[model samples]
Target: SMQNPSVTISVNANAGRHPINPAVYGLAYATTATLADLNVPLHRYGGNNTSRYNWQLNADNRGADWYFESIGEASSVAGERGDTFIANSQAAGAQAMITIPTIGWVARLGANRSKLASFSIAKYGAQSGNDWQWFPDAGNGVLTSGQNVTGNNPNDANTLVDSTFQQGWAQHLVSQWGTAAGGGLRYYILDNEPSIWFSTHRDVHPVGPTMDEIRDKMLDYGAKIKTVDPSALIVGPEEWGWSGYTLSGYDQQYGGLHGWSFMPDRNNHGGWDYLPWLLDQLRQNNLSTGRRLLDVFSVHYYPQGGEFGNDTSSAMQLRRNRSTRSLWDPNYIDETWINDKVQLIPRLKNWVSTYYPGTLTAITEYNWGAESHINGATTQADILGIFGREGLDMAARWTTPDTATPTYKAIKMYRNYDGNKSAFGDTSVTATAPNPDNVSAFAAVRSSDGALTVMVINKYLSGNTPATINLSNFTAQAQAQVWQLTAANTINHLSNVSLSGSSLSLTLPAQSVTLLVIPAST
Candidate 1:
């Protein structure tokens, strides 16, 4: 039998240097205390619910995610959720990214708990499903006759709104907190994944929207927010995934009818991809209007296969470990429905640079799943490295994992590796590993103290990996502090390693994430 191979990691502190945006470590939702604990830099108040958030009534519609019903403020406390989110995010020293409804509607007030839903049993007859325990009349948008219901009035649970309503909300936010220029409430997302609104919010937006429709809505609503809060950054499109990137909602809904070869939207837009065409439209609008409409281009990503799930079986875990390569690896073809190279970050960067120069990019929602497991932790660690190394401006994980889970420890390793809040570096450095399938590495230099930090993740399910870490263009102290998360699923302090010149040799435990802190030479 062949022996286990050794992996070599090389790091050059002065090469491939770029500032790692602190906002990369962000969460979609979290408690104030946990936010403070993880030192999270950004917090997002958005999801399917936010697609139809009613700022005035402090309510939100569950949309198709639930039963097309509106609910009271998500918080029991007596204030708007947005107000509390922004205030608490400030308390935790994190910036808030709030979503504004561009769907031209907001959930009706005081309608959900009493069983007044978009599709009611009284109006649409008995349905296939219902929450019989409490709101028995709220149907699940399906009929008892084994057919999907249609033509439900949007006003059944929502009130039609315009950009004026959204502008009013933005103005009120400025009045309550402050202006974005003065660090009030910045980063307003246009909406959540509009491409799937035909299915997710069919009660309101019944048909798949065309590319021109999406562009017009963004230009109108995003510009309205700018009129009120000009300093606030507008993030938009927020496509769902791979198919959404290439086809408009309309194209996706009707592609099968046209043999999937002739896409009306792409054809109409000179055969440009959906996102690229959308960006070019915004750029041209900015040129004509002399004001930028979109500030940050954002999207949501989830591995399109069962790999990104809670299955911790031997084979699934192995797939999960290798799945992150789809983010930045050019040669790695995705092993899922998207059987092609994703190279997502650079692909987006290139799209924005080509169509809308100077626009920032964000993956506002993503999850590798199985956060409770150790394998998920290692994948999470690898994703963080790729985000920094690939130069993404911002990212907010879809939801925060439990504080006790190994996935949380994976994030803490970069944000607060030491008990006293010691963190990974702000400046990214050149780093590479020979056997990426079994190992991954990232290096950075902490600007605050001139500390060199290298993160090494061993993805092998068994057998310890003997690794050689070489450092160049930077002086290092003789000893390197070590912290790790192993199968025990805890981030524990480990004994320091002695360095021979600028290199260190260590045996990395199987399926582990290790952080090395080497102080600059005196």
Candidate 2:
């Protein structure tokens, strides 16, 4: 037997990966049929329109299009009373519905108001009778004050109470779902980017609360949610990254003064500078329920053009791509440099571990501009691999369709290949290659039947490279299937995929992605 040197590579199993946040995942323009055809579940389906009461019956009459209806008075009341209220709307029929616990309503107590909290539920009604519920908060709990709705004016009292109320609502939902149903609600977000809607823009002004106040509110809510359902997770700070900048240039374009009155303060810089203090406050308050309040601290990454500016060099561009590249680009220094340069995720994990160990991370909003044409499929495929290999919980590639960007094709192909495959509850096995950055690979053993899955990415920006994979540790005579997403053409359907077997010899097009699944020989 040949002696092999002992090799040890640390793996973080809790790095749960998913697509971007609910709002931007498929881009709002994506038709329900387009989404369903891809097997992608819409978190809040048809109720995205702002007019809460306008949700009609039989809304999704056209294919996957669904209707939005109130979850009925029961869930709404329960949402406010801090009680668990489960109800099936006549409109929704059998479709699952979401109930958003009313928050900030109680603050009207000082003014003339009824004891019953005013709140609403957003539900999706499908024609085929496959409705789904998306409760903002399951239990009856409303925000009296603390945070402000988009255009609502908020004071200190209102801010504190509203923020707490939102947290309580989230906690209440988690508690109800965890107890009433084994699995919890699909998603939980702190608030849509507060800076854009609440602070500087036309919605509201004075942005009253300070960053510290905002931080406190977030911690307070995080604590409440954790108490109710420990397993329930949070995605947050939902700010547009541009809002995090200070200088306000070119009619507030260059410096970060684009939206609303709540532009990043030059004195305090932006959320990036203030987030450290927020983490400290979270730890001091023990708001994470003995666990980190934020399972995945989120940020939005939208590379406006293929590059951020004219000064952007190919090296810098490649660096950005490499930072987010997956398996095939082993020599790629993107993630490594990002960890060192940006220091966002690394710092977050450090702070979380210092207070609450095992805290995870993710990026909810990310894309190029409002459309998907910039880097197209090439960037999308590369970034997807980077996220997976890096163990990111979820990375939503902005806007699914409308113009049919290359990124959309990449996502479609990736989803189709791994849709039913097991990546959860599986240990990550490492593989070595000559060009570490250009190639990357990770293996997982399925929990259900102990089958193994190997995901490989060749991120070389140039020509195809031979990937010599050694799977000696597992077993022999294993059968493998390969799925490739290439730039040769747009992959509108999974039927367009090309596959090969055995020794695994294939051409990985310039800036493309591929996944290989090998069944265990045991």
Candidate 3:
């Protein structure tokens, strides 16, 4: 074991460590057929689809297609809020992170308004062909959003008009589904990316909206949310994309004005970032009225860089693999403009602390790579470790992710670590990997058994094996069982790991991850 430089993993188990939320393990774009076997704690019924979803029987798709996405991303479903999302998700033991129609989508509710009661292929209808926007299936007769409803703005769905109708529509949702768990939905997101909707949802809100209008709507609907379900977990402004986080959709697109508006301005750059401004407004109201408007500080983040996802060269894969460090490493400056802000998790925490102190943090929508790719799995697991260790209250990846890929494996590494019932702990302990460039590890004490679960990710190429995990403070009395996920095999296992007192060593294969499970007795 002395051949490999030992890495010390110090742990008191008794020493107080920050609490890690088990709820952060969540997913997006869930369906009953898809979610039956998945065990993620939360399923986000979000994205561009939420704002456009006509839950009043889901009679039609009345939302904007963020001008920058692929044609395959548009949608047009005609149904209602039922077992499809709310019921199925809750039944699966996965909480729902759904959106309420705050942008006045009920104006498009035409014939389906009072006549519709629930969703049905016959009652409303279904797009059996092209699902997403601008899609035609290339003459394959697919019923796409573009094909089903020709032109940009059809007669059926006009501009956003008549708040009376929208308000009534929102109230209906609250009355119907505002029951407690074992019956109705509990968590609600204010809306999906209101900052960028002017462009993404250009069809309805073509001129875009000022921050004032967005905030006012939050207040109006935020009240509506609590009035219905006072205890509901209400989140807002799921602004996780590029410019939306810092400059905001408005300031970044319009110009560099109104950058700073709220109080205790920490950045001191003079302009308040869009997210900070939103938090301030909610806090102001909370202070004045005694009702906490925003319960969670939610933001979406998809890490980008030169060495990140977007390209396909082997060089690109290597960059993507290495990019995970930027999530928390203050030293790892991203190879892009994002380098200016690398400690994303910590930065968000600071923002939450400075502006809305009591609000929780969540990343409701985020994705890093194609579902099938190996790097996607690596990134998913890597991001999960960072989120759990960093104390993110909740998080859910975007897109209908592939279960066969490494993303599933990475999640199971913690959520499902044993032959029957083993999991990552709810409390995160102080464990440091001095050399995170080539190898990194995170340790948690499972609430179920108080067993230590150490996950180590090796990021070297073929022959670049480096430092083995050197345990400190944590004295082991038994040979720790290990599960390996490497390029060589998917379900690899090892129980023959050698230990030398507080110093233990193992072979770290290149570009691989291993889950080390140690009993609490030793």
Candidate 4:
């Protein structure tokens, strides 16, 4: 019988060395326990609901996600959710990224519990859908006639406000937790994805905002936040996916408004892509004031391909295994509607380097679906590795994974691999694998003990992958500790394997992630 092909992982501990930002291990929302358990470094407190958050009421409007209902805790405390989120993050020793609304309107308590929404059925008559039992009169922004209910009063479940409102909120945060310079909430996201505001928040911002409008809003709100807490980091233009990076929301919706078939804003602004133009505008504003307004250039990403969906078929699983290439591989064309190379991390970094040098890049929200499945775990593991290896500044998965699930285990593998606090190294190094389509590898040198840690992932569904890892520039002890998470979703500490000179040979189980920690010669 013919032997199976062997994979080669060439590791150069001295080459390609760079500090991997710990914030890359982050989640959009996480409980205090999970945060500490996984050693999560960044906890994000922002989402679609935050677009219309009312700090005074400790409330948020669901917007298009629901019936645009204004929901709040009955607690008398102001900024209750924000306070709790920040407190929990602090308790977990993680930095909190809070989203501040720039939408001009904030959610307000309705006349009664049943009428707590923007489009009231009591005023506009019954609409398409309602909670029936809980919020009977809260229409889903649609009329019984199958038409979107327009002319509804924005004040019904919302209060209009300006930068002054946000300023007060910033002050409140500073008073409660101390300024960002003193370790308060440091990362302040400028609302959520605004490019889809026309659809997501149409009840208030019905018209798609022009590029100039968004630019002005960022400058205004961003400057206000900075003034209130000069040390706070303002993260902005937190846009949605691909087209959002290329065209303004106005260009997307008002294509005919400019008498052109293509993007109107792109043409009006020297044909520069939407992000670069925004960054340049921000840079220009900073130059004018000599103050840094936008601290982080961030965007949200979900695989445009079907990789993010929960199909779970053999073909879909295989696709998910290879989907991570979109993060850094220019040769791999996206498999779905995009049909082009994503190479996302470097792409955004290049834009920042060109238009707004020194600005950091982040993907504040992303998900690869199927958090319950092994394939999802594999994809997530691959993503985290890519984030560190490619020099991404920060990232937060869309929704926190459930405890002890495959996806959570994947994170724990890098974060708390030994059930202790021992984690993946702070510095990334050169580790390349042959046939990366089936096997992925990452290596790092831990600063604490000068040990070399290698992570190898076998993407094959059913076959064990035999690989030989060749190490250089580091003298390893005779044996290396091995920890692995197989399809069973358990982090098993296997027996230590011996190394022969600068090389180690092992057969990785199918659909598994293995971490090899080798001690350096003392």
Q: Write candidate 3's Cα lDDT for 1-522 as tens digits.
A: 222344544545545478888678888776654454445667887777566555434543434332211121122333345335767786677777777767664324334242211112222245343224443221211133534322233223432433344445445555666554434566778778876665555545544455667778888887876776677778878875656766545555455334445322223335666677778878888889999878887877776654334454666666766676666667777777665646767767888898889899888877777445555555666778888788888888776565566656667676765534367777887667666655667888877776777888775545545445555556565677788777543647777566566556767766677888776663
Tens digits of per-residue lDDT for model 2, 198-274: 22222212233345555655666666765666665665655455334222112133133345454444355434344
The alpha-carbon lDDT assigned to residue 140 of candidate 2 equals 19
Model 3, C-alpha of 371: deviation from truth (Å): 3.4
lDDT, model 2, position 504: 40
- Model 2 TM-score, 2 decimals: 0.56
Candidate 1 C-alpha error for residue 388, in Å: 0.3
lDDT tens per residue, model 1, 219-295: 99988888888899999888999999988888887784567878887788888788989999999999898999899
Report clashes for each candidate as comma-separated counts.
0, 74, 18, 0
**Pairs of colliding residues, candidate 4:** none
Superposed Cα deviation of residue 499, candidate 4 (Å): 0.7
Q: Model 4, range 109-167, lDDT digits (tens) per residue?
A: 85443236888788988789976777787888888888888888888888998988988
Q: Candidate 1: TM-score? A: 0.96
